XYZ file of N, CA, C and O in Angstrom:
660
model
N 170.167 -32.866 -88.687
C 169.629 -31.919 -89.657
C 168.351 -32.450 -90.311
O 168.224 -32.474 -91.540
N 167.384 -32.884 -89.463
C 166.125 -33.409 -89.955
C 165.147 -32.246 -90.179
O 165.149 -31.259 -89.441
N 164.325 -32.368 -91.236
C 163.289 -31.361 -91.452
C 162.338 -31.347 -90.246
O 162.179 -32.368 -89.571
N 161.757 -30.196 -89.937
C 160.813 -30.131 -88.815
C 159.716 -31.149 -89.005
O 159.186 -31.369 -90.099
N 159.367 -31.823 -87.890
C 158.447 -32.927 -87.948
C 157.116 -32.553 -88.535
O 156.478 -33.316 -89.234
N 156.647 -31.310 -88.242
C 155.348 -30.897 -88.756
C 155.271 -30.963 -90.279
O 154.199 -31.227 -90.823
N 156.383 -30.726 -90.964
C 156.420 -30.783 -92.416
C 156.527 -32.195 -92.970
O 156.537 -32.376 -94.185
N 156.608 -33.196 -92.095
C 156.757 -34.569 -92.506
C 155.490 -35.375 -92.169
O 155.507 -36.592 -92.277
N 154.421 -34.717 -91.755
C 153.232 -35.354 -91.237
C 152.098 -35.266 -92.268
O 151.942 -34.217 -92.917
N 151.335 -36.347 -92.432
C 150.147 -36.349 -93.279
C 148.931 -36.680 -92.433
O 148.897 -37.725 -91.790
N 147.924 -35.808 -92.475
C 146.598 -36.138 -91.950
C 145.952 -37.060 -92.974
O 146.069 -36.829 -94.169
N 145.342 -38.158 -92.520
C 144.640 -39.061 -93.451
C 143.194 -39.105 -93.041
O 142.839 -39.741 -92.034
N 142.326 -38.421 -93.809
C 140.889 -38.485 -93.580
C 140.200 -39.603 -94.350
O 140.759 -40.250 -95.251
N 138.946 -39.855 -93.975
C 138.112 -40.803 -94.707
C 138.504 -42.258 -94.549
O 138.277 -43.063 -95.446
N 139.085 -42.598 -93.398
C 139.518 -43.964 -93.160
C 138.318 -44.898 -93.042
O 137.282 -44.519 -92.518
N 138.479 -46.145 -93.515
C 137.587 -47.192 -93.036
C 137.722 -47.315 -91.515
O 138.815 -47.197 -90.976
N 136.597 -47.593 -90.854
C 136.640 -47.767 -89.422
C 137.417 -49.037 -89.030
O 137.765 -49.212 -87.874
N 137.615 -49.939 -89.995
C 138.415 -51.142 -89.818
C 139.931 -50.873 -89.790
O 140.693 -51.730 -89.326
N 140.382 -49.730 -90.299
C 141.816 -49.471 -90.346
C 142.401 -49.271 -88.930
O 141.813 -48.564 -88.084
N 143.534 -49.886 -88.695
C 144.299 -49.825 -87.439
C 145.627 -49.125 -87.641
O 146.074 -48.893 -88.779
N 146.275 -48.761 -86.526
C 147.654 -48.298 -86.601
C 148.486 -49.219 -87.486
O 149.245 -48.757 -88.361
N 148.333 -50.521 -87.294
C 149.135 -51.489 -88.027
C 148.813 -51.507 -89.511
O 149.729 -51.558 -90.358
N 147.522 -51.441 -89.893
C 147.195 -51.549 -91.317
C 147.485 -50.212 -92.018
O 147.907 -50.195 -93.179
N 147.271 -49.107 -91.336
C 147.691 -47.795 -91.846
C 149.188 -47.808 -92.157
O 149.609 -47.354 -93.223
N 150.007 -48.261 -91.199
C 151.437 -48.289 -91.392
C 151.849 -49.211 -92.551
O 152.683 -48.849 -93.385
N 151.270 -50.434 -92.621
C 151.641 -51.332 -93.704
C 151.309 -50.736 -95.052
O 152.018 -51.029 -96.022
N 150.271 -49.916 -95.143
C 149.994 -49.253 -96.418
C 151.009 -48.159 -96.699
O 151.666 -48.160 -97.748
N 151.167 -47.207 -95.772
C 151.955 -46.017 -96.116
C 153.464 -46.226 -96.000
O 154.213 -45.403 -96.496
N 153.894 -47.332 -95.403
C 155.299 -47.661 -95.419
C 155.820 -47.978 -96.817
O 157.046 -48.038 -97.002
N 154.954 -48.169 -97.807
C 155.442 -48.395 -99.165
C 156.158 -47.186 -99.735
O 156.930 -47.336 -100.688
N 155.938 -45.989 -99.199
C 156.538 -44.769 -99.760
C 157.564 -44.132 -98.818
O 158.029 -43.040 -99.100
N 157.921 -44.772 -97.700
C 158.944 -44.209 -96.868
C 158.943 -44.808 -95.483
O 158.026 -45.565 -95.091
N 159.983 -44.467 -94.739
C 160.069 -44.853 -93.337
C 159.097 -44.012 -92.515
O 159.117 -42.779 -92.577
N 158.256 -44.680 -91.729
C 157.295 -43.999 -90.874
C 157.826 -43.935 -89.435
O 158.048 -44.975 -88.808
N 158.023 -42.705 -88.937
C 158.390 -42.543 -87.535
C 157.159 -42.549 -86.622
O 157.305 -42.799 -85.426
N 155.986 -42.274 -87.168
C 154.739 -42.207 -86.399
C 153.599 -42.664 -87.304
O 153.636 -42.426 -88.506
N 152.597 -43.285 -86.694
C 151.433 -43.752 -87.453
C 150.321 -44.061 -86.459
O 150.462 -45.005 -85.666
N 149.237 -43.271 -86.500
C 148.211 -43.279 -85.440
C 146.840 -43.217 -86.100
O 146.592 -42.363 -86.948
N 145.922 -44.121 -85.681
C 144.518 -43.975 -86.037
C 143.792 -43.379 -84.835
O 143.959 -43.859 -83.692
N 143.024 -42.335 -85.057
C 142.310 -41.668 -83.951
C 141.090 -42.478 -83.570
O 140.345 -42.980 -84.415
N 140.920 -42.683 -82.268
C 139.858 -43.533 -81.727
C 139.136 -42.813 -80.602
O 139.718 -41.980 -79.905
N 137.867 -43.160 -80.417
C 137.130 -42.685 -79.239
C 137.816 -43.181 -77.972
O 138.227 -44.345 -77.895
N 137.997 -42.314 -76.957
C 138.704 -42.785 -75.756
C 137.883 -43.759 -74.926
O 138.484 -44.526 -74.160
N 136.560 -43.797 -75.055
C 135.747 -44.751 -74.291
C 135.389 -46.024 -75.076
O 135.523 -47.125 -74.539
N 134.902 -45.891 -76.307
C 134.456 -47.050 -77.072
C 135.568 -47.756 -77.824
O 135.398 -48.898 -78.260
N 136.696 -47.055 -78.080
C 137.794 -47.489 -78.935
C 137.398 -47.564 -80.401
O 138.177 -48.050 -81.214
N 136.200 -47.104 -80.751
C 135.770 -47.118 -82.139
C 136.542 -46.033 -82.914
O 136.748 -44.908 -82.407
N 136.959 -46.367 -84.109
C 137.736 -45.410 -84.937
C 136.953 -44.121 -85.138
O 135.735 -44.137 -85.308
N 137.681 -42.985 -85.131
C 137.107 -41.711 -85.526
C 137.195 -41.485 -87.032
O 136.695 -40.478 -87.537
N 137.790 -42.438 -87.773
C 137.744 -42.353 -89.240
C 138.829 -41.483 -89.823
O 138.735 -41.153 -91.004
N 139.831 -41.106 -89.029
C 140.978 -40.399 -89.571
C 142.191 -40.721 -88.719
O 142.086 -41.336 -87.646
N 143.352 -40.298 -89.186
C 144.568 -40.531 -88.457
C 145.681 -39.713 -89.066
O 145.432 -38.797 -89.837
N 146.914 -40.055 -88.708
C 148.030 -39.354 -89.329
C 149.236 -40.272 -89.363
O 149.340 -41.241 -88.625
N 150.142 -39.964 -90.288
C 151.408 -40.663 -90.377
C 152.476 -39.589 -90.463
O 152.229 -38.475 -90.928
N 153.685 -39.936 -90.010
C 154.827 -39.044 -90.060
C 155.973 -39.792 -90.753
O 156.393 -40.853 -90.288
N 156.485 -39.223 -91.830
C 157.600 -39.832 -92.544
C 158.944 -39.310 -91.990
O 159.000 -38.308 -91.277
N 160.018 -40.005 -92.363
C 161.336 -39.553 -91.898
C 161.809 -38.316 -92.658
O 162.604 -37.532 -92.134
N 161.314 -38.129 -93.880
C 161.773 -37.024 -94.736
C 160.613 -36.415 -95.525
O 159.579 -37.064 -95.752
N 160.802 -35.168 -95.942
C 159.775 -34.525 -96.748
C 159.661 -35.224 -98.115
O 158.554 -35.353 -98.654
N 160.790 -35.707 -98.657
C 160.741 -36.398 -99.942
C 159.814 -37.598 -99.894
O 159.142 -37.911 -100.884
N 159.764 -38.240 -98.737
C 158.844 -39.364 -98.572
C 157.404 -38.893 -98.592
O 156.552 -39.550 -99.228
N 157.097 -37.789 -97.915
C 155.759 -37.193 -98.004
C 155.384 -36.990 -99.470
O 154.288 -37.348 -99.913
N 156.292 -36.347 -100.218
C 156.035 -36.101 -101.638
C 155.710 -37.404 -102.373
O 154.722 -37.472 -103.113
N 156.532 -38.432 -102.157
C 156.298 -39.740 -102.779
C 154.908 -40.277 -102.421
O 154.176 -40.771 -103.297
N 154.527 -40.206 -101.140
C 153.202 -40.667 -100.754
C 152.117 -39.856 -101.467
O 151.138 -40.419 -101.988
N 152.293 -38.534 -101.545
C 151.247 -37.703 -102.112
C 151.170 -37.926 -103.620
O 150.090 -37.886 -104.214
N 152.323 -38.183 -104.247
C 152.366 -38.489 -105.685
C 151.744 -39.839 -106.001
O 151.408 -40.089 -107.166
N 151.634 -40.713 -105.019
C 151.038 -42.017 -105.237
C 149.521 -42.052 -105.017
O 148.923 -43.125 -105.091
N 148.912 -40.898 -104.750
C 147.454 -40.832 -104.681
C 146.847 -41.262 -106.034
O 147.493 -41.094 -107.077
N 145.621 -41.806 -106.049
C 144.710 -42.106 -104.901
C 145.148 -43.297 -104.090
O 145.643 -44.306 -104.608
N 144.967 -43.236 -102.766
C 145.344 -44.293 -101.846
C 144.076 -45.032 -101.394
O 143.169 -44.408 -100.857
N 144.015 -46.318 -101.687
C 142.926 -47.179 -101.216
C 143.498 -47.981 -100.052
O 144.437 -48.756 -100.240
N 142.952 -47.740 -98.870
C 143.445 -48.316 -97.613
C 142.329 -49.140 -97.030
O 141.256 -48.602 -96.749
N 142.586 -50.423 -96.853
C 141.588 -51.376 -96.359
C 140.281 -51.205 -97.122
O 139.188 -51.180 -96.559
N 140.401 -51.065 -98.458
C 139.262 -51.041 -99.360
C 138.595 -49.689 -99.531
O 137.585 -49.616 -100.248
N 139.053 -48.650 -98.889
C 138.422 -47.337 -98.988
C 139.429 -46.306 -99.480
O 140.592 -46.307 -99.053
N 139.016 -45.435 -100.405
C 139.893 -44.356 -100.849
C 139.932 -43.262 -99.787
O 138.879 -42.704 -99.420
N 141.120 -42.937 -99.303
C 141.304 -41.984 -98.225
C 141.709 -40.627 -98.768
O 141.927 -40.462 -99.987
N 141.835 -39.636 -97.871
C 142.136 -38.245 -98.262
C 143.330 -37.754 -97.468
O 143.183 -37.188 -96.378
N 144.535 -37.975 -97.987
C 145.709 -37.434 -97.304
C 145.885 -35.955 -97.595
O 145.661 -35.483 -98.720
N 146.331 -35.208 -96.568
C 146.642 -33.796 -96.659
C 147.825 -33.484 -95.755
O 147.914 -34.041 -94.664
N 148.715 -32.635 -96.218
C 149.787 -32.155 -95.358
C 149.244 -31.383 -94.160
O 148.194 -30.731 -94.251
N 149.940 -31.490 -93.046
C 149.533 -30.835 -91.805
C 149.627 -29.331 -91.943
O 150.440 -28.789 -92.681
N 148.768 -28.629 -91.184
C 148.671 -27.185 -91.311
C 149.988 -26.524 -90.876
O 150.594 -26.891 -89.871
N 150.410 -25.533 -91.664
C 151.724 -24.860 -91.559
C 152.841 -25.773 -91.060
O 153.592 -25.394 -90.156
N 141.719 -25.487 -94.921
C 142.137 -24.444 -95.864
C 142.636 -25.041 -97.195
O 143.753 -24.757 -97.620
N 141.802 -25.843 -97.857
C 142.242 -26.643 -99.014
C 141.790 -25.990 -100.306
O 140.587 -25.975 -100.624
N 142.731 -25.445 -101.075
C 142.417 -24.714 -102.314
C 143.453 -25.065 -103.380
O 144.517 -25.625 -103.083
N 143.134 -24.694 -104.608
C 143.952 -25.064 -105.753
C 144.589 -23.857 -106.420
O 145.258 -24.034 -107.439
N 144.414 -22.641 -105.874
C 144.793 -21.419 -106.545
C 145.699 -20.595 -105.670
O 145.521 -20.546 -104.443
N 146.681 -19.905 -106.285
C 147.623 -19.091 -105.521
C 147.685 -17.692 -106.101
O 147.524 -17.477 -107.318
N 147.882 -16.735 -105.206
C 148.286 -15.375 -105.521
C 149.807 -15.333 -105.589
O 150.490 -15.860 -104.680
N 150.353 -14.715 -106.641
C 151.794 -14.572 -106.798
C 152.052 -13.099 -107.007
O 151.669 -12.542 -108.043
N 152.699 -12.452 -106.038
C 152.919 -11.006 -106.089
C 154.380 -10.685 -106.182
O 155.214 -11.510 -105.861
N 154.695 -9.454 -106.618
C 156.084 -9.039 -106.743
C 156.744 -9.427 -108.042
O 157.995 -9.448 -108.112
N 155.976 -9.733 -109.077
C 156.535 -10.165 -110.352
C 156.784 -9.018 -111.315
O 157.401 -9.216 -112.360
N 156.329 -7.796 -110.973
C 156.640 -6.613 -111.763
C 156.110 -6.728 -113.186
O 155.175 -7.493 -113.430
N 156.721 -6.004 -114.129
C 156.176 -5.877 -115.481
C 156.882 -6.735 -116.509
O 156.373 -6.875 -117.627
N 158.026 -7.310 -116.195
C 158.791 -8.103 -117.163
C 158.571 -9.622 -117.031
O 159.133 -10.373 -117.812
N 157.760 -10.065 -116.068
C 157.525 -11.489 -115.877
C 156.402 -11.971 -116.798
O 155.331 -11.363 -116.834
N 156.661 -13.029 -117.533
C 155.727 -13.536 -118.526
C 155.160 -14.885 -118.110
O 155.577 -15.485 -117.094
N 154.198 -15.365 -118.895
C 153.503 -16.609 -118.521
C 154.463 -17.783 -118.486
O 154.363 -18.661 -117.641
N 155.453 -17.793 -119.389
C 156.402 -18.903 -119.409
C 157.300 -18.931 -118.172
O 157.707 -19.988 -117.739
N 157.585 -17.752 -117.589
C 158.395 -17.720 -116.368
C 157.642 -18.398 -115.226
O 158.209 -19.239 -114.508
N 156.399 -18.015 -115.016
C 155.565 -18.610 -113.985
C 155.330 -20.073 -114.279
O 155.381 -20.925 -113.366
N 155.028 -20.422 -115.544
C 154.792 -21.813 -115.906
C 156.006 -22.706 -115.559
O 155.883 -23.710 -114.866
N 157.188 -22.317 -116.084
C 158.366 -23.178 -115.934
C 158.701 -23.436 -114.474
O 159.248 -24.487 -114.150
N 158.461 -22.454 -113.609
C 158.704 -22.595 -112.182
C 157.639 -23.452 -111.512
O 157.908 -24.516 -110.965
N 156.370 -23.014 -111.609
C 155.273 -23.611 -110.862
C 154.842 -24.978 -111.383
O 154.238 -25.736 -110.623
N 155.143 -25.313 -112.635
C 154.794 -26.655 -113.118
C 155.544 -27.749 -112.375
O 155.124 -28.907 -112.445
N 156.658 -27.421 -111.712
C 157.409 -28.393 -110.916
C 156.773 -28.633 -109.555
O 157.281 -29.471 -108.807
N 155.719 -27.900 -109.204
C 154.920 -28.147 -108.034
C 153.672 -28.981 -108.319
O 153.176 -29.703 -107.445
N 153.179 -28.890 -109.544
C 152.035 -29.681 -109.934
C 151.506 -29.269 -111.263
O 152.099 -28.407 -111.940
N 150.424 -29.879 -111.675
C 149.851 -29.638 -112.997
C 149.095 -28.309 -113.007
O 148.157 -28.120 -112.219
N 149.497 -27.396 -113.867
C 148.841 -26.102 -113.936
C 147.611 -26.197 -114.836
O 147.665 -26.779 -115.929
N 146.534 -25.572 -114.398
C 145.340 -25.416 -115.229
C 145.107 -24.008 -115.751
O 144.667 -23.859 -116.895
N 145.422 -22.969 -114.990
C 145.215 -21.590 -115.427
C 146.356 -20.722 -114.907
O 146.723 -20.833 -113.724
N 146.916 -19.883 -115.771
C 147.786 -18.821 -115.323
C 147.153 -17.509 -115.734
O 146.824 -17.316 -116.917
N 146.965 -16.599 -114.777
C 146.318 -15.314 -115.075
C 147.222 -14.198 -114.588
O 147.332 -13.940 -113.394
N 147.864 -13.526 -115.546
C 148.690 -12.365 -115.232
C 147.786 -11.121 -115.211
O 147.107 -10.825 -116.214
N 147.755 -10.420 -114.083
C 146.837 -9.312 -113.883
C 147.289 -8.036 -114.569
O 148.459 -7.667 -114.507
N 146.336 -7.339 -115.197
C 146.616 -6.117 -115.913
C 145.629 -5.049 -115.440
O 144.536 -5.363 -114.970
N 146.020 -3.780 -115.618
C 145.132 -2.702 -115.188
C 143.906 -2.633 -116.056
O 143.993 -2.660 -117.286
N 142.728 -2.519 -115.410
C 141.455 -2.451 -116.124
C 141.412 -1.293 -117.087
O 140.778 -1.389 -118.153
N 142.049 -0.169 -116.754
C 141.928 1.011 -117.577
C 143.003 1.107 -118.640
O 142.744 1.542 -119.766
N 144.232 0.713 -118.304
C 145.400 0.956 -119.130
C 145.961 -0.295 -119.783
O 146.717 -0.185 -120.741
N 145.635 -1.488 -119.273
C 146.215 -2.700 -119.772
C 147.631 -2.968 -119.278
O 148.194 -3.997 -119.632
N 148.205 -2.080 -118.469
C 149.546 -2.322 -117.958
C 149.540 -3.429 -116.917
O 148.567 -3.605 -116.192
N 150.624 -4.204 -116.882
C 150.731 -5.268 -115.897
C 150.792 -4.693 -114.498
O 151.496 -3.729 -114.236
N 149.999 -5.288 -113.598
C 149.900 -4.803 -112.240
C 150.938 -5.398 -111.315
O 151.048 -4.968 -110.154
N 151.708 -6.398 -111.771
C 152.756 -6.990 -110.975
C 152.365 -8.163 -110.111
O 153.079 -8.465 -109.139
N 151.279 -8.863 -110.448
C 150.927 -10.067 -109.739
C 150.100 -10.966 -110.658
O 149.688 -10.572 -111.756
N 149.928 -12.223 -110.234
C 149.277 -13.222 -111.058
C 148.597 -14.243 -110.156
O 148.872 -14.313 -108.961
N 147.712 -15.009 -110.759
C 147.076 -16.158 -110.119
C 147.380 -17.423 -110.919
O 147.381 -17.393 -112.154
N 147.701 -18.483 -110.195
C 147.956 -19.776 -110.796
C 147.025 -20.773 -110.146
O 146.938 -20.836 -108.915
N 146.314 -21.551 -110.957
C 145.364 -22.554 -110.532
C 145.906 -23.927 -110.942
O 146.263 -24.108 -112.101
N 146.012 -24.826 -109.980
C 146.521 -26.162 -110.235
C 145.368 -27.166 -110.273
O 144.260 -26.868 -109.871
N 145.663 -28.354 -110.775
C 144.612 -29.367 -110.770
C 144.413 -30.016 -109.394
O 143.534 -30.868 -109.265
N 145.237 -29.671 -108.409
C 145.168 -30.398 -107.141
C 145.764 -29.572 -106.012
O 146.721 -28.790 -106.210
N 145.234 -29.757 -104.805
C 145.596 -28.892 -103.690
C 146.992 -29.142 -103.147
O 147.523 -28.265 -102.459
N 147.600 -30.303 -103.403
C 148.890 -30.553 -102.740
C 149.982 -29.670 -103.303
O 150.964 -29.348 -102.614
N 149.821 -29.261 -104.566
C 150.755 -28.316 -105.151
C 150.786 -27.021 -104.366
O 151.843 -26.547 -103.954
N 149.597 -26.465 -104.100
C 149.497 -25.234 -103.303
C 150.086 -25.451 -101.905
O 150.790 -24.584 -101.385
N 149.748 -26.580 -101.271
C 150.261 -26.831 -99.930
C 151.782 -26.858 -99.917
O 152.397 -26.346 -98.969
N 152.393 -27.483 -100.926
C 153.850 -27.497 -100.985
C 154.388 -26.083 -101.200
O 155.425 -25.713 -100.680
N 153.682 -25.290 -102.029
C 154.170 -23.947 -102.408
C 154.181 -23.022 -101.185
O 155.152 -22.281 -100.956
N 153.107 -23.028 -100.408
C 152.952 -21.975 -99.400
C 153.812 -22.229 -98.163
O 153.989 -21.311 -97.351
N 154.347 -23.441 -97.986
C 155.204 -23.695 -96.855
C 156.641 -23.298 -97.167
O 157.462 -23.227 -96.234
N 156.983 -23.092 -98.434
C 158.322 -22.605 -98.754
C 158.521 -21.204 -98.189
O 157.624 -20.381 -98.173
N 159.753 -20.953 -97.710
C 160.047 -19.632 -97.175
C 160.223 -18.609 -98.297
O 159.881 -17.432 -98.136
N 160.724 -19.028 -99.465
C 161.074 -18.109 -100.553
C 160.546 -18.621 -101.881
O 160.417 -19.831 -102.094
N 160.253 -17.701 -102.796
C 159.951 -18.069 -104.174
C 160.633 -17.057 -105.075
O 160.466 -15.848 -104.908
N 161.431 -17.555 -106.014
C 162.216 -16.706 -106.926
C 161.762 -17.077 -108.331
O 161.925 -18.226 -108.763
N 161.148 -16.113 -109.010
C 160.664 -16.314 -110.368
C 161.178 -15.146 -111.218
O 160.929 -13.979 -110.885
N 161.871 -15.467 -112.307
C 162.375 -14.412 -113.203
C 163.242 -13.405 -112.441
O 163.095 -12.193 -112.560
N 164.124 -13.930 -111.576
C 164.965 -13.125 -110.725
C 164.279 -12.397 -109.585
O 164.983 -11.846 -108.715
N 162.960 -12.385 -109.515
C 162.212 -11.647 -108.512
C 161.958 -12.507 -107.294
O 161.576 -13.669 -107.411
N 162.074 -11.898 -106.127
C 161.620 -12.516 -104.881
C 160.106 -12.283 -104.778
O 159.672 -11.109 -104.735
N 159.290 -13.349 -104.742
C 157.866 -13.239 -104.876
C 157.136 -13.575 -103.578
O 157.606 -14.401 -102.794
N 155.987 -12.940 -103.375
C 155.085 -13.290 -102.281
C 153.989 -14.191 -102.825
O 153.343 -13.834 -103.796
N 153.811 -15.341 -102.199
C 152.860 -16.316 -102.696
C 151.939 -16.688 -101.538
O 152.410 -16.915 -100.411
N 150.643 -16.721 -101.817
C 149.683 -17.040 -100.795
C 148.492 -17.759 -101.430
O 148.261 -17.621 -102.642
N 147.767 -18.543 -100.621
C 146.548 -19.184 -101.085
C 145.524 -18.129 -101.530
O 145.406 -17.071 -100.909
N 144.827 -18.387 -102.617
C 143.781 -17.513 -103.134
C 142.424 -18.186 -103.069
O 142.266 -19.292 -103.621
N 141.456 -17.502 -102.450
C 140.056 -17.953 -102.205
C 139.852 -19.470 -102.346
O 138.966 -20.047 -101.722
């Protein structure tokens, strides 16, 4: 009953060209068991392409690694990102109807990351709630964690959530 491997993988950009499979692993093994750890290299020169990826045994380990940012690896600050299924900090939240308030969205989404803006949409002409909102976080990993979830339940409502611009 292991989580799908794609959800346990981190792309690591901005590597020092000195970083190896071995030094990448020794760094990121501090936050979990690594089943995979690869630095991308030119197939002819063997010179690093400056990025790679690691795969943890569990999603909780990915979370731990992401929560331990910033990561300085072989003297350079790198850029870890979760693997695809587009880096933004804002989400569209739809299906919240007219009874959902800012505290409902806050209490739920603050457990994904630090919120900077909550905007509940209202009709330009009437002021009535239109049934959707935008939430802006201080960091993209919150959004990445949010949009891979199959379901979101806020204030009893089943919500549609998607990345916003």
